[PDB]
Amino acid sequence: PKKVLTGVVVSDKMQKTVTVLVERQFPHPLYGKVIKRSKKYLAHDPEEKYKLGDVVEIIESRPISKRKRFRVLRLVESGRMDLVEKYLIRRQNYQSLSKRGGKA
């Protein structure tokens, strides 16, 4: 069955396409503790119907481009930048960890 995933829309700065951050949990193959790993999917949005913070379901689809092999199925719940925030900060935090100085 076409895989259906649920995540948050982190990117919007794209034409007819939104980035969905999808998380998953699983026991560590050796150490047991449940660990959270995430992934961003570029999903199709022909009507530009979804925005940042929208928790949407994504479904496995016929390729729309390179990178785009998923389409936004439906909206699960909207508005919630608390999720977008983690992503943004975690993104900005990248300033500190490097060779060049940065007010991260």
Partner RNA sequence: UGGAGAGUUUGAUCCUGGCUCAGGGUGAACGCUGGCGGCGUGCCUAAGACAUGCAAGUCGUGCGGGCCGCGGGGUUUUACUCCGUGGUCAGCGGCGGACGGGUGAGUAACGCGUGGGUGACCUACCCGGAAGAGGGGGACAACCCGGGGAAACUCGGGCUAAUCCCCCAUGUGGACCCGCCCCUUGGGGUGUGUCCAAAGGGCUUUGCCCGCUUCCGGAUGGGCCCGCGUCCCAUCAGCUAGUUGGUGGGGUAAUGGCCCACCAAGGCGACGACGGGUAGCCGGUCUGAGAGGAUGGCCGGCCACAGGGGCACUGAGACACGGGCCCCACUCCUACGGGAGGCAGCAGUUAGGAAUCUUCCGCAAUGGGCGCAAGCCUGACGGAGCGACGCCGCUUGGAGGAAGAAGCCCUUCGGGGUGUAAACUCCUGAACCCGGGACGAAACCCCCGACGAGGGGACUGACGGUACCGGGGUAAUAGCGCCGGCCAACUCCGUGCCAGCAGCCGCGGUAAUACGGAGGGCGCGAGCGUUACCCGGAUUCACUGGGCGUAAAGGGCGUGUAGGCGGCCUGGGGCGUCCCAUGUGAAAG
What residues make contact with RNA under the rule CB under 7 A?
Answer: 1-3, 11, 13-17, 19, 24-27, 29-42, 44, 46, 60-69, 71, 86, 89-91, 93-94, 97-100
Q: Between residues 79 and 90, which has the closer beta carbon with respect to RNA?
A: 90
CB of 92 to RNA, least distance (A): 8
Q: Decide if 9 contacts 49 (C-beta within 8 A).
A: no
Separation CA 29–CA 98 (nearest Å) = 30
CB of 53 to RNA, least distance (A): 15
Q: Decide if 57 contacts 71 (C-beta within 8 A).
A: no
Q: Between residues 60 and 81, which has the closer beta carbon with respect to RNA?
A: 60
Q: Between residues 67 and 74, which has the closer beta carbon with respect to RNA?
A: 67
Separation CA 55–CA 5 (nearest Å) = 10
Question: Which residue spans within 28-95 are E strands per DSSP?
Answer: 34-44, 55-60, 70-77
